[PDB]
Design a protein around this ligand. Structure first.
Ligand SMILES: CCCCCCCCOCCOCCOCCOCCO
Ligand SMILES: CCCCCCCCOCCOCCOCCOCCO
Ligand SMILES: CCCCCCCCOCCOCCOCCOCCO
Ligand SMILES: CCCCCCCCOCCOCCOCCOCCO
Ligand SMILES: CCCCCCCCOCCOCCOCCOCCO
Ligand SMILES: CCCCCCCCOCCOCCOCCOCCO
Ligand SMILES: CCCCCCCCOCCOCCOCCOCCO
Ligand SMILES: CCCCCCCCOCCOCCOCCOCCO
Ligand SMILES: CCCCCCCCOCCOCCOCCOCCO
Ligand SMILES: CCCCCCCCOCCOCCOCCOCCO
Ligand SMILES: CCCCCCCCOCCOCCOCCOCCO
Ligand SMILES: CCCCCCCCOCCOCCOCCOCCO
Ligand SMILES: [Ca+2]
Ligand SMILES: [Ca+2]
Ligand SMILES: [Ca+2]
Ligand SMILES: [Ca+2]
Ligand SMILES: [Ca+2]
Ligand SMILES: [Ca+2]
Ligand SMILES: [Ca+2]
Ligand SMILES: [Ca+2]
Ligand SMILES: [Ca+2]
Lengths: 301, 301, 301
């Protein structure tokens, strides 16, 4: 079976200096089936991703049963699969100054590429959830060695609370050229009625020149070394009637390179029927950074 | 909600010297919704446009209410939105020698580009219609200055007749490099039963080197100047049973560069069920020009 | 009318030296209609082919009636349209060492390209079938001369047996640069209940440097000459319950260049509901060649 859904948005976005019109529309194909014994299977991708979905680079394919779910393609890594992101600000998703996304080390297109899908396994039973993910270590479908990513995460929900932890790592094919990386995460999520609170703390080490590129800094001409880092953040959103209001703040601190605090604040108003008016403000504390903002409408179909 | 429709065509096309097979198929995604108070919203794009629809370059998104309709993306400019084009000739739409399209100055991909949608506002009440359109003046979603287009048009229907006028303009970011342009249009449309008649007259001024490029002439190495131009045309089509027969003639006259008269004549025969046999002939009076022609079938799905 | 269907696959594939994850998903658009007198028409293409389907390069458009069926776009040539391919091995279709496809000389993207569809005509009456195909001889929709392909084939079914023959040819635009080519085929297909047997023999001549490129050999710097070739193969597959087992062997023998025997063996297990577990092995006898293999699941939607 093949089902269709879609979304679209239109409005004005401020890039720090000028306003521009910003709009888009997308269609999602959701495909599903069930075998004779009740294993469920499916696949999905968006219309603008159709070339990539044909090589494994975009979209996902899955098989699930009593054993849990196996998904291959452009999949999330294990930690992101269980804890997600902080409150999304602005109708265009204003990630220009850092954004709402939590800084996971693996999955979500870190190594996914043409002819190179990644794997995500999930399982839940009651109150508990576990996820595990990995890439295959070879470029495309070739025999050339690639960096290889892997992660494992577990969560437990008790009442209003889910708490969890994840561990992620990237193994370098050549540690003279790129240091191995790893990150450990603790995440907590709480709903107190109309209010959602999400918080995380992450700690680990990154390749030096990969870390410098986060801050848009040229690499140093030396053999690869690792730098220690930490990241933590929080978001709060609450709904009163048709109005949701929310925001987040995150800081990323990489030893010997730099630190940044980035944040955003936005609101939406539900018009019903799949339409909402959405606007927001986002920034970070780096020297140059002017605040980005937007105001428009989002539609679901 | 997401609906599907499509079209396809196949036949033989003569390019002035040789015949070639010419065929295509397309799918249109039409998405729609209604808010709780009855504002209607939607989006559409074709499958071959899906990459562009995701940045605002192709397809359109709209919101309408009692106030009229706001559309953003790859939109028509205000004059084209109210008066359209002359009778379309040939199953492949034989625009090779000039074509049936009326020469509007703005909208319809004049400035629309990646991350750069344009805006069209329309409103009707009874017998009267107004449209207004503009681009935002900045390249992409950047702060780089772009040419900016704008147009306004109004029409009035009285019986068999709609008459209207439009005014369009493009403001140059640097008039040493490209002159400002403007065009005023008068259009009339009349249906006399099975017969449709459409006529327009346009007058204004164009950038010199933009005008020379219409006639495929190299630019002159001097500071930009403006040239005066006029354009006018007429088409007639009539239906008798399953057969429609029609044609058009247009002339474009640009002062100090050149003039051209271009025309076409074609027919279609409806087979019912969404299929028709369509063929046509088109040419212009320039020196080289051999007549283009085609014959094939068009399908709607 | 527009209908949707799709497919997806995921598993592990061995390239001769290493295992890699390999997955994809696709959506097919099938469009159909009927005229008032009952001529049927349609078009189809897959979502990843939507750009190509808009110029004639990918997908097909057709019209059929009592006269047979005319199809234009990315069509099969006449022989492939009647006799098909040998048993397909592996969930990824392991064609890496030669594959299951029968080596037809024309159609199936030999000359199909942007703005350049090819034509396939088919007709059946009772026990007999005929097909005829051709390209138009001009590059794109231009007047530049291209190689031109053509083929004719006929088949007759009597009981469990279909036997047939086809003749295919490519006319070179310049025989100093590329020799003319031709191939004659005899094919037989037999179903003996759960068992399918397909066999063919082909004989003809190929351009020298086109033949050398099959074996990945550099061209010779001389005026084009033709080399004689023969190809023949067989496949057998049988189904017992949910299990199909099958394989094929083909040899290609080009005089003065080289010969190769390539083969594959695979199985599938139907899980019902549109899902199957599929795996296979394939190889050829050339010097370097290590065996390719895969194991995964295929889904239809
Ligand atoms: C020259 C400025 C052009 C600005 C064009 C904006 C196009 C997008 O429309 C959305 C703007 O956000 C505000 C809210 O619109 C929602 C409808 O009105 C509410 C009725 O209950
Ligand atoms: C553990 C891996 C973390 C990788 C993703 C981190 C994403 C963090 O967002 C950083 C936010 O800052 C934005 C970019 O910095 C460039 C700013 O311009 C420099 C001078 O103002
Ligand atoms: C297991 C979860 C533990 C999570 C603990 C950390 C959550 C709090 O960190 C939030 C960020 O630090 C706040 C201060 O930054 C202030 C300045 O930015 C301007 C905001 O307008
Ligand atoms: C806290 C949530 C709300 C954040 C709202 C941000 C403010 C947005 O409103 C201002 C819109 O006015 C800007 C100008 O429009 C520019 C149009 O571009 C066309 C130029 O000719
Ligand atoms: C070697 C020349 C090949 C030409 C191929 C033409 C393919 C397209 O078919 C359409 C041609 O236009 C003529 C009309 O066809 C309509 C069906 O016949 C009418 C029955 O009432
Ligand atoms: C007001 C803006 C008008 C811009 C669009 C005008 C489109 C007009 O069609 C012109 C028709 O002539 C075709 C092109 O000329 C090249 C012919 O080859 C030269 C020698 O034969
Ligand atoms: C407010 C609407 C006013 C419209 C007036 C103009 C309509 C007529 O112009 C049409 C073109 O001029 C006709 C002469 O060209 C003849 C030669 O071309 C060969 C045709 O086979
Ligand atoms: C006034 C409306 C009618 C316009 C009809 C134009 C004339 C079309 O009919 C002629 C078709 O015959 C041309 C040849 O077919 C070429 C096929 O290409 C394959 C070459 O091997
Ligand atoms: C680290 C190795 C990862 C391998 C991932 C394989 C992902 C694809 O799954 C398909 C493998 O083929 C075997 C059969 O799976 C079918 C389900 O089990 C049968 C229940 O009746
Ligand atoms: C009549 C036209 C035939 C054109 C298609 C033939 C396809 C045949 O498959 C050939 C199989 O061999 C694979 C390619 O050879 C390269 C191997 O590497 C060389 C040294 O091992
Ligand atoms: C009109 C149809 C006539 C078809 C006759 C030919 C069919 C048989 O040819 C098959 C291939 O030759 C078999 C020998 O190759 C053996 C070695 O390869 C290793 C297999 O594991
Ligand atoms: C005759 C039909 C059966 C052909 C089956 C081929 C054999 C397939 O099974 C072996 C799978 O085990 C291989 C290893 O998995 C590799 C995963 O890649 C991740 C590396 O970290
Ligand atoms: Ca985001
Ligand atoms: Ca992410
Ligand atoms: Ca790989
Ligand atoms: Ca046209
Ligand atoms: Ca136009
Ligand atoms: Ca812009
Ligand atoms: Ca194959
Ligand atoms: Ca083939
Ligand atoms: Ca051609």
């Amino acid at each position: 079976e093949v089902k269709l859904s879609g979304d679209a948005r239109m409005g004005v976005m401020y890039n720090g200096d000028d306003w521009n019109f910003s709009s888009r529309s997308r269609v999602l194909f959701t495909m599903s089936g069930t075998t004779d014994s009740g294993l469920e299977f499916g696949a999905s991708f968006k219309a603008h991703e159709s070339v990539g979905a044909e090589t494994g680079e975009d979209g996902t394919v899955f098989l699930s049963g009593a054993f849990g779910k196996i998904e291959m393609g452009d999949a999330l890594g294990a930690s992101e699969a269980l804890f997600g992101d902080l409150y999304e600000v602005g109708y265009t998703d204003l990630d220009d100054r850092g954004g709402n996304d939590i800084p996971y080390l693996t999955g979500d297109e870190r190594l996914t590429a043409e002819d190179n899908p990644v794997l995500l396994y999930t399982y839940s039973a009651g109150a508990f959830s576990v996820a595990a993910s990995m890439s295959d270590g070879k470029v495309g479908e070739t025999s050339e060695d690639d960096a290889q990513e892997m992660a494992v995460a577990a969560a437990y929900t008790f009442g209003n609370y889910t708490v969890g932890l994840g561990y992620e790592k990237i193994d370098s094919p050549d540690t003279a050229l790129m240091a191995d990386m790893e990150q450990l995460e603790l995440a907590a999520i709480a709903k107190f009625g109309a209010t959602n609170v999400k918080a995380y703390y992450a700690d680990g080490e990154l390749d030096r020149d990969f870390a410098r590129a986060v801050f848009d800094l040229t690499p140093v001409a030396a053999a690869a070394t690792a730098v220690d880092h930490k990241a933590y953040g929080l978001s709060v959103d609450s709904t009163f009637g048709a109005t949701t209001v929310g925001g987040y703040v995150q800081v990323l601190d990489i030893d010997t390179i730099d630190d940044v605090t980035y944040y955003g604040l936005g609101a939406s108003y539900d018009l019903g029927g799949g339409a909402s008016i959405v606007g927001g403000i986002a920034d970070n504390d780096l020297p140059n950074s002017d605040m980005v903002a937007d105001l428009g409408v989002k539609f679901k179909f």
